[model samples]
Target: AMLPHGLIVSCQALPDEPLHSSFIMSKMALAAYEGGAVGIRANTKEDILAIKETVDLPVIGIVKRDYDHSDVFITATSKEVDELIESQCEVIALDATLQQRPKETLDELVSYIRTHAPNVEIMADIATVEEAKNAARLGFDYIGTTLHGYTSYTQGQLLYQNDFQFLKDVLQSVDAKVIAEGNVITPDMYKRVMDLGVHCSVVGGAITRPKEITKRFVQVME
Candidate 1:
């Protein structure tokens, strides 16, 4: 268990987001480490390198890019996998959705990672049960419900709905380790997934993105 069955903080900020610098993300990763997070989920090789330098915990690296013809952007292609390998992250998470990808097929990308970075583990960021099953069949080391609410087939969906029934369904369905991600915000939500027997859980916006946090807080006062 490289992730050690606990919280994996996602520390990421794109160019449009407020905390976009590698240094700031490293600081955020450091804070997560100091606060007892088991692992770090980071974007881009630069940020992954900085976070790895800042903390001793393993990192789940991903690269989010917008493609002209494809909607699969979270580690969408082999190019992103190569970058994650360059960063030496313990895990490389790829979008395992059923939608059309930018270039190569999901199987090709998985094979590419296995051939190039044989030591690194692979995580499948899937939205549905069929995707989860497909990722497991493709031999991903971890299956994450990371894109549960963000896919074309599941728009307006959320991972926390119905007491995490999606997580439960994935847990029971997949042969690989199930990682609860997506909308795992509050402590209660976190603990609920953990108790449901997920291999490990990842919490992002809730613990990292301050802009989103502030927006949520301000929304209540409206």
Candidate 2:
């Protein structure tokens, strides 16, 4: 049930809040490294650079900037990709959700990255099984369930329902490395995903966001 290469701790604090400083992120990265995380996933160029300078683990960088006209914005555009490349992230993750992005098509963005940033590996943060298969076919190096419950089709779905039926379906249908993410609330859930053959898993709020953790506890207690 253990993760294949251990965990990938995402150090993002809040997309709009600047409270998660680079110094704080560095400390978290250090703690995760000590805790045996195989890699780190972080948002923003500044934080990514700071963590890279502070730690030795591979970094998966993403930029979360929503455009007024688009529903997709996790590494949504070419500009973010360029910034990630400049930050020297080992892997750059993008929104591969079924929702329409700022741009007209994902193929254009994917092709641009392939042509311009060939050295950086691409990880697609996908939602549905169809998107997972599409991303793999489109040449993403890794496929992650980071957007599992955020997409239009899966708006209200719970991540671990039916014994992770959605996750199992994605794994069974794809050839890319499956990195389980999104709303993995407990250690048991994390274990369950890995036991199903996930290459790695990313757990964020449960380990970092006190507000979210507190909310979960409050909801359960209520």
Candidate 3:
């Protein structure tokens, strides 16, 4: 079923990254699955398809496409939504941040998903508490604090600070299920988020990106 107080591994490798093959990502999903991941969040249709072929867990699909007009690229358009639906992922996550989208409005994209992929759940990858509230109002099945530090307004900030006060505020503000994401980099951090009562959580670079992981480990030598 749906993600509930469990870890959802984001098994993605960007085009420019070293481990960018769909086969590699499928194996990554498999590894995470073996390590007790409850779900998988992936990018691109090919990766999602491969991961589904390799794992039995539910997948949260997204397409990272860039547009000249907008900074919101996490499933930024209906085209991406269509791609996710075609991949047959159980859940589709979109950039629910209050930034300017390339063309369609958030409501339009949600409506498009409802009309075409009615069974797929919609997740909102939001940056702020206000954005989370807006996503809840729009009827998103899951609201994730995924872009909390990446947005222009939030720039260098992180969700792990101040005892996760932002997440605490988001939980207090929205009735929808909140997913803790982004800087959930360590086991202690993950446990802290769970203690704060998130519906579920996602860990990406920490568990999936080997290069990034190596970099973090190597920093101790400096």
Candidate 4:
């Protein structure tokens, strides 16, 4: 309920990334807020708390964990759910790819969220139209087309003549509110997703990751 309308900036960085510190993410979120972001999506409990303290906007929380036994690691298990609830993020984002997990089935993991942290909203990060449908039926508070390009099974899936069509398709199919995420590179692209009827959208990397930002510029110049 704290998450407001429109552009939710995902201000995050991995441990190896340059912008990894909680203090820096706090500043990055403050910059995003100044730039008109209505909400902030961030990784790790530390970053989430820092951003919450920095901005009055709602925080979408996640914990990025990599397990050798599984590939589903954006809030991969109920373990992450517990941490997110503790962080007091308004929304929790998770990998909802139906892939193998180390400790629990997606069913059990989501159930654990419901059982242990029912009050916290869960956002399902999905890779397909079916997964989007799967998340809606599972009672996830939000559906995010965030993992389409990142999953092993869905790598390169978003390459299309009309990339926006996926968002359109998911929105048309699901009863749940969809959040347009992933590879949305331009202001016009974000606008296109909004025009297609998204409840809100998340823009990451392009705005917050300077390495990624410079890479884009370098590629375009090449």
Q: TM-score of every model?
A: 0.97, 0.92, 0.97, 0.94
Better of 1 and 3 by lDDT: 3
Per-residue lDDT of 61-167 in model 3, one digit per residue for the tens? 99999999899999999889888988999999999986888988888888889999988899999999889989999999999988999888999889988999899
Residue 79's lDDT in candidate 1: 84
Candidate 1 structure quality by residue, lDDT tens digits, 1-222: 577888899998889788899999999999999999999999999999988888999999999999998999999888888889889999999998868888888888888999999999989999999999999999999999988888778998899888888888988887689999987878998888889999888988999998888999999999
Q: Which candidate ranks first by lDDT, i.e. highest?
A: 3
Q: Is 1 or 4 the stronger prediction by TM-score?
A: 1
Order by lDDT, highest first: 3, 1, 2, 4
- Candidate 2 per-residue C-alpha lDDT over 1-222 given as tens digits, one digit per residue, 9 for 90 to 100: 122466899998764554478878888889899888889999889999889888988999999888987889898888888898888888888998657777647888889888888877888998899999999999888999988888777888767888988889999999889998888888999889889998998988887777788788899878
Instruction: Kindly list the per-residue Cα lDDT of model 4 for residues 123-184, writing each as its tens digit.
Output: 89998899999899898889998888788877667722276777878898898888888877
What is the Cα-based lDDT of residue 95 in candidate 2? 92
CA lDDT of each prediction against the hidden true structure: 0.90, 0.85, 0.91, 0.85
Q: What's the CA error at residue 76 for candidate 3, in Å?
A: 1.2
Structure candidate 1, residue pairs in collision:
none
Give candidate 2's TM-score. Answer: 0.92
